[PDB]
Amino acid sequence: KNVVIYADGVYDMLHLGHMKQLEQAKKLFENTTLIVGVTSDNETKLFKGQVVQTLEERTETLKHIRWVDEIISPCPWVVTPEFLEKYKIDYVAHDDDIYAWLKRAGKFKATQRTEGVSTTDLIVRILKNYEDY
Amino acid sequence: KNVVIYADGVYDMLHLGHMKQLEQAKKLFENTTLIVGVTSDNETKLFKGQVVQTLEERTETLKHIRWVDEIISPCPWVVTPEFLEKYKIDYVAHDDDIYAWLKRAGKFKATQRTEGVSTTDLIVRILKNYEDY
């Protein structure tokens, strides 16, 4: 009955969008365990992009999030069939391709992005109080 | 046995510092109910200071925080003896004076600020990547 759900990501400057994704992943089924993977400083900066907080910082913050049941930190850069097996993962939850194989395997669950709620969006709102001229 | 704890604040651009305060308030006793009061856009801007997010935004985010059991939104600008009675509050948790009377009443519990972990501190870290010259 309990369904094990896995979501990975950077979770840099955690905001409501991350939280709503995590909420969504948690509530995919009646009874779940949500496992969250936190990608490393190094594999992120290299393959993905710039990151403000250290792995330890990003990892610490996620402990405060209601929906998060387990944290893997650092997580493998790439999910594999072996990892899903090792960690008993029924579904990987992510937004809508390194996920195509999870879809083909029937082990993918889409969650939805939330727009305009990021940490940087809030700073932009602060800056908009100052007119160009 | 269950101890009812009350913490109020703006909770603008919620960050790890808020979270650690909330954690601390939650864990003051073995069994607690943590009630969190979210101060209004209007009474904050007036009596306190500038605020980025609306009451609804600040309130929504707190729902994602593990430690938070109940939310009062908007909360009364000022705690009163009557409010503590109405909401069965045993202790108000806050950092270390509109709290002196709670101390005198033996209904105050200090929590600790966390420095350097605020939303704005993270933006400052971003900006430091750009040299003045």
mmCIF file of N, CA, C and O in Angstrom, chain A residues 13-16 19-20 23 52-54 57 60-69 116-117 119-120 122-123 125-126, chain B residues 13-16 19-20 23 52-54 57 60-69 116-117 119-120 122-123 125-126:
data_model
loop_
_atom_site.group_PDB
_atom_site.id
_atom_site.type_symbol
_atom_site.label_atom_id
_atom_site.label_comp_id
_atom_site.label_asym_id
_atom_site.label_seq_id
_atom_site.Cartn_x
_atom_site.Cartn_y
_atom_site.Cartn_z
ATOM 1 N N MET A 13 18.223 27.855 -2.475
ATOM 2 C CA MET A 13 17.339 28.921 -1.999
ATOM 3 C C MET A 13 15.892 28.483 -2.023
ATOM 4 O O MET A 13 15.079 28.996 -2.804
ATOM 5 N N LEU A 14 15.597 27.497 -1.191
ATOM 6 C CA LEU A 14 14.313 26.832 -1.206
ATOM 7 C C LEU A 14 13.162 27.829 -1.114
ATOM 8 O O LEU A 14 13.166 28.706 -0.262
ATOM 9 N N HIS A 15 12.185 27.687 -2.002
ATOM 10 C CA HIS A 15 11.033 28.569 -2.025
ATOM 11 C C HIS A 15 9.760 27.755 -2.186
ATOM 12 O O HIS A 15 9.800 26.519 -2.246
ATOM 13 N N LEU A 16 8.638 28.465 -2.274
ATOM 14 C CA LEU A 16 7.311 27.867 -2.299
ATOM 15 C C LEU A 16 7.114 26.928 -3.486
ATOM 16 O O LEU A 16 6.312 25.998 -3.431
ATOM 17 N N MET A 19 8.564 23.695 -2.507
ATOM 18 C CA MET A 19 7.669 23.168 -1.495
ATOM 19 C C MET A 19 6.410 22.585 -2.116
ATOM 20 O O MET A 19 5.978 21.502 -1.730
ATOM 21 N N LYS A 20 5.840 23.272 -3.099
ATOM 22 C CA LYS A 20 4.611 22.777 -3.712
ATOM 23 C C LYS A 20 4.881 21.533 -4.557
ATOM 24 O O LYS A 20 4.051 20.625 -4.594
ATOM 25 N N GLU A 23 5.178 18.873 -1.973
ATOM 26 C CA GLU A 23 3.847 18.565 -1.485
ATOM 27 C C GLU A 23 3.172 17.617 -2.452
ATOM 28 O O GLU A 23 2.630 16.580 -2.059
ATOM 29 N N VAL A 52 23.884 28.972 -5.189
ATOM 30 C CA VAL A 52 24.208 29.822 -4.051
ATOM 31 C C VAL A 52 24.635 29.085 -2.788
ATOM 32 O O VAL A 52 25.652 29.414 -2.190
ATOM 33 N N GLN A 53 23.840 28.112 -2.362
ATOM 34 C CA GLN A 53 24.083 27.462 -1.081
ATOM 35 C C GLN A 53 24.852 26.160 -1.214
ATOM 36 O O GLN A 53 24.749 25.472 -2.218
ATOM 37 N N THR A 54 25.610 25.815 -0.181
ATOM 38 C CA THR A 54 26.321 24.545 -0.153
ATOM 39 C C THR A 54 25.348 23.375 0.008
ATOM 40 O O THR A 54 24.216 23.558 0.443
ATOM 41 N N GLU A 57 23.829 23.263 3.355
ATOM 42 C CA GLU A 57 22.813 24.290 3.575
ATOM 43 C C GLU A 57 21.477 23.911 2.935
ATOM 44 O O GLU A 57 20.396 24.098 3.507
ATOM 45 N N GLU A 60 20.006 20.985 4.897
ATOM 46 C CA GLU A 60 19.511 21.343 6.226
ATOM 47 C C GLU A 60 18.105 21.932 6.120
ATOM 48 O O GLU A 60 17.205 21.584 6.892
ATOM 49 N N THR A 61 17.905 22.792 5.132
ATOM 50 C CA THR A 61 16.632 23.472 4.951
ATOM 51 C C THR A 61 15.487 22.498 4.676
ATOM 52 O O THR A 61 14.385 22.662 5.215
ATOM 53 N N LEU A 62 15.751 21.486 3.855
ATOM 54 C CA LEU A 62 14.757 20.483 3.482
ATOM 55 C C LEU A 62 14.220 19.686 4.671
ATOM 56 O O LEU A 62 13.116 19.146 4.617
ATOM 57 N N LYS A 63 15.013 19.589 5.733
ATOM 58 C CA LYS A 63 14.593 18.948 6.984
ATOM 59 C C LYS A 63 13.408 19.641 7.640
ATOM 60 O O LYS A 63 12.687 19.047 8.441
ATOM 61 N N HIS A 64 13.205 20.900 7.288
ATOM 62 C CA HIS A 64 12.144 21.686 7.871
ATOM 63 C C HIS A 64 10.846 21.546 7.094
ATOM 64 O O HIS A 64 9.789 22.020 7.536
ATOM 65 N N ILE A 65 10.918 20.882 5.938
ATOM 66 C CA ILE A 65 9.752 20.789 5.059
ATOM 67 C C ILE A 65 8.915 19.579 5.437
ATOM 68 O O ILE A 65 9.412 18.455 5.494
ATOM 69 N N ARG A 66 7.649 19.854 5.732
ATOM 70 C CA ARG A 66 6.659 18.883 6.168
ATOM 71 C C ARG A 66 6.618 17.599 5.349
ATOM 72 O O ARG A 66 6.501 16.515 5.893
ATOM 73 N N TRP A 67 6.656 17.734 4.032
ATOM 74 C CA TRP A 67 6.406 16.602 3.145
ATOM 75 C C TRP A 67 7.564 15.640 3.030
ATOM 76 O O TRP A 67 7.385 14.514 2.576
ATOM 77 N N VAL A 68 8.758 16.108 3.395
ATOM 78 C CA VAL A 68 9.970 15.343 3.184
ATOM 79 C C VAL A 68 10.122 14.290 4.273
ATOM 80 O O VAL A 68 10.174 14.627 5.442
ATOM 81 N N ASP A 69 10.169 13.020 3.883
ATOM 82 C CA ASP A 69 10.304 11.926 4.838
ATOM 83 C C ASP A 69 11.756 11.454 4.968
ATOM 84 O O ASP A 69 12.220 11.125 6.060
ATOM 85 N N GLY A 116 6.522 32.265 -10.753
ATOM 86 C CA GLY A 116 6.493 33.550 -10.069
ATOM 87 C C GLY A 116 6.630 33.513 -8.559
ATOM 88 O O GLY A 116 6.346 34.502 -7.885
ATOM 89 N N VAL A 117 7.064 32.379 -8.016
ATOM 90 C CA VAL A 117 7.191 32.255 -6.573
ATOM 91 C C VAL A 117 8.622 31.937 -6.128
ATOM 92 O O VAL A 117 8.858 31.581 -4.970
ATOM 93 N N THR A 119 12.704 32.472 -5.162
ATOM 94 C CA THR A 119 13.494 33.429 -4.383
ATOM 95 C C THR A 119 13.888 34.627 -5.237
ATOM 96 O O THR A 119 13.771 35.772 -4.805
ATOM 97 N N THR A 120 14.350 34.373 -6.455
ATOM 98 C CA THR A 120 14.766 35.484 -7.296
ATOM 99 C C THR A 120 13.568 36.326 -7.744
ATOM 100 O O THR A 120 13.683 37.546 -7.848
ATOM 101 N N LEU A 122 11.106 37.088 -5.923
ATOM 102 C CA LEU A 122 10.822 37.973 -4.799
ATOM 103 C C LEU A 122 11.783 39.161 -4.773
ATOM 104 O O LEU A 122 11.393 40.282 -4.436
ATOM 105 N N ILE A 123 13.039 38.930 -5.137
ATOM 106 C CA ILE A 123 13.998 40.028 -5.206
ATOM 107 C C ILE A 123 13.624 40.983 -6.333
ATOM 108 O O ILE A 123 13.739 42.194 -6.210
ATOM 109 N N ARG A 125 10.663 41.622 -7.258
ATOM 110 C CA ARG A 125 9.548 42.399 -6.720
ATOM 111 C C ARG A 125 10.059 43.517 -5.823
ATOM 112 O O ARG A 125 9.516 44.612 -5.820
ATOM 113 N N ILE A 126 11.116 43.248 -5.073
ATOM 114 C CA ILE A 126 11.719 44.286 -4.248
ATOM 115 C C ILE A 126 12.264 45.410 -5.129
ATOM 116 O O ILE A 126 12.061 46.593 -4.848
ATOM 117 N N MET B 13 9.434 36.297 3.215
ATOM 118 C CA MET B 13 10.502 35.558 2.541
ATOM 119 C C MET B 13 11.116 34.525 3.460
ATOM 120 O O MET B 13 12.283 34.636 3.860
ATOM 121 N N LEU B 14 10.300 33.548 3.821
ATOM 122 C CA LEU B 14 10.657 32.577 4.832
ATOM 123 C C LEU B 14 12.002 31.922 4.532
ATOM 124 O O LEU B 14 12.239 31.472 3.420
ATOM 125 N N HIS B 15 12.875 31.880 5.531
ATOM 126 C CA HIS B 15 14.189 31.287 5.380
ATOM 127 C C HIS B 15 14.500 30.401 6.575
ATOM 128 O O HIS B 15 13.671 30.245 7.481
ATOM 129 N N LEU B 16 15.707 29.842 6.571
ATOM 130 C CA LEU B 16 16.140 28.861 7.556
ATOM 131 C C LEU B 16 16.117 29.412 8.980
ATOM 132 O O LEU B 16 15.968 28.666 9.945
ATOM 133 N N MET B 19 12.652 29.089 10.165
ATOM 134 C CA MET B 19 12.441 27.665 10.340
ATOM 135 C C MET B 19 13.084 27.162 11.622
ATOM 136 O O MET B 19 12.470 26.397 12.360
ATOM 137 N N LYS B 20 14.300 27.613 11.912
ATOM 138 C CA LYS B 20 14.980 27.140 13.114
ATOM 139 C C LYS B 20 14.324 27.702 14.374
ATOM 140 O O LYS B 20 14.245 27.007 15.386
ATOM 141 N N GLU B 23 11.304 25.556 14.715
ATOM 142 C CA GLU B 23 11.724 24.257 15.204
ATOM 143 C C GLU B 23 11.902 24.327 16.706
ATOM 144 O O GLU B 23 11.383 23.492 17.451
ATOM 145 N N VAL B 52 7.777 42.247 1.629
ATOM 146 C CA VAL B 52 7.682 41.801 0.245
ATOM 147 C C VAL B 52 6.408 41.043 -0.109
ATOM 148 O O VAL B 52 5.754 41.354 -1.096
ATOM 149 N N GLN B 53 6.076 40.026 0.676
ATOM 150 C CA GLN B 53 4.967 39.149 0.324
ATOM 151 C C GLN B 53 3.672 39.522 1.023
ATOM 152 O O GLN B 53 3.684 40.050 2.124
ATOM 153 N N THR B 54 2.550 39.224 0.381
ATOM 154 C CA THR B 54 1.247 39.449 0.990
ATOM 155 C C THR B 54 1.000 38.468 2.138
ATOM 156 O O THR B 54 1.648 37.429 2.223
ATOM 157 N N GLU B 57 0.503 35.021 0.956
ATOM 158 C CA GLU B 57 1.731 34.369 0.508
ATOM 159 C C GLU B 57 2.567 33.865 1.685
ATOM 160 O O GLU B 57 3.130 32.763 1.669
ATOM 161 N N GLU B 60 0.719 30.934 3.287
ATOM 162 C CA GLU B 60 0.725 29.711 2.484
ATOM 163 C C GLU B 60 2.035 28.953 2.693
ATOM 164 O O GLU B 60 2.045 27.731 2.876
ATOM 165 N N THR B 61 3.137 29.687 2.712
ATOM 166 C CA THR B 61 4.456 29.088 2.843
ATOM 167 C C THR B 61 4.627 28.341 4.165
ATOM 168 O O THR B 61 5.200 27.245 4.194
ATOM 169 N N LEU B 62 4.119 28.924 5.247
ATOM 170 C CA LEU B 62 4.216 28.343 6.584
ATOM 171 C C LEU B 62 3.530 26.982 6.707
ATOM 172 O O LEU B 62 3.876 26.183 7.577
ATOM 173 N N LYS B 63 2.540 26.732 5.857
ATOM 174 C CA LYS B 63 1.861 25.433 5.786
ATOM 175 C C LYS B 63 2.794 24.294 5.402
ATOM 176 O O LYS B 63 2.516 23.126 5.673
ATOM 177 N N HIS B 64 3.906 24.641 4.777
ATOM 178 C CA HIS B 64 4.854 23.654 4.317
ATOM 179 C C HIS B 64 5.882 23.318 5.383
ATOM 180 O O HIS B 64 6.675 22.378 5.224
ATOM 181 N N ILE B 65 5.864 24.076 6.481
ATOM 182 C CA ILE B 65 6.883 23.911 7.518
ATOM 183 C C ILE B 65 6.437 22.858 8.518
ATOM 184 O O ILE B 65 5.352 22.944 9.091
ATOM 185 N N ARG B 66 7.287 21.847 8.669
ATOM 186 C CA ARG B 66 7.072 20.693 9.527
ATOM 187 C C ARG B 66 6.571 21.020 10.928
ATOM 188 O O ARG B 66 5.696 20.353 11.450
ATOM 189 N N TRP B 67 7.176 22.018 11.555
ATOM 190 C CA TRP B 67 6.934 22.282 12.971
ATOM 191 C C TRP B 67 5.618 22.965 13.255
ATOM 192 O O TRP B 67 5.159 22.967 14.394
ATOM 193 N N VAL B 68 5.041 23.588 12.226
ATOM 194 C CA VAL B 68 3.863 24.413 12.402
ATOM 195 C C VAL B 68 2.620 23.538 12.485
ATOM 196 O O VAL B 68 2.336 22.794 11.564
ATOM 197 N N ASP B 69 1.898 23.618 13.599
ATOM 198 C CA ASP B 69 0.692 22.823 13.795
ATOM 199 C C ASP B 69 -0.578 23.616 13.469
ATOM 200 O O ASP B 69 -1.532 23.081 12.902
ATOM 201 N N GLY B 116 23.023 35.218 9.467
ATOM 202 C CA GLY B 116 23.623 34.942 8.169
ATOM 203 C C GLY B 116 22.897 33.940 7.291
ATOM 204 O O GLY B 116 23.461 33.446 6.316
ATOM 205 N N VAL B 117 21.647 33.633 7.624
ATOM 206 C CA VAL B 117 20.897 32.657 6.851
ATOM 207 C C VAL B 117 19.614 33.238 6.246
ATOM 208 O O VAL B 117 18.758 32.498 5.755
ATOM 209 N N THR B 119 17.047 35.375 3.653
ATOM 210 C CA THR B 119 16.880 35.519 2.205
ATOM 211 C C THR B 119 17.788 36.616 1.662
ATOM 212 O O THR B 119 18.450 36.436 0.643
ATOM 213 N N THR B 120 17.827 37.756 2.341
ATOM 214 C CA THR B 120 18.656 38.842 1.845
ATOM 215 C C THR B 120 20.146 38.515 1.979
ATOM 216 O O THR B 120 20.935 38.890 1.113
ATOM 217 N N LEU B 122 21.442 35.695 1.412
ATOM 218 C CA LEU B 122 21.752 34.857 0.258
ATOM 219 C C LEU B 122 21.941 35.699 -1.003
ATOM 220 O O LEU B 122 22.797 35.400 -1.840
ATOM 221 N N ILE B 123 21.157 36.760 -1.144
ATOM 222 C CA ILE B 123 21.324 37.653 -2.286
ATOM 223 C C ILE B 123 22.656 38.388 -2.187
ATOM 224 O O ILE B 123 23.347 38.597 -3.175
ATOM 225 N N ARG B 125 25.299 37.186 -0.920
ATOM 226 C CA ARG B 125 26.292 36.193 -1.327
ATOM 227 C C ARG B 125 26.358 36.095 -2.844
ATOM 228 O O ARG B 125 27.427 35.928 -3.412
ATOM 229 N N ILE B 126 25.216 36.213 -3.503
ATOM 230 C CA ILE B 126 25.201 36.213 -4.960
ATOM 231 C C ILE B 126 25.975 37.418 -5.495
ATOM 232 O O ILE B 126 26.780 37.296 -6.422
#
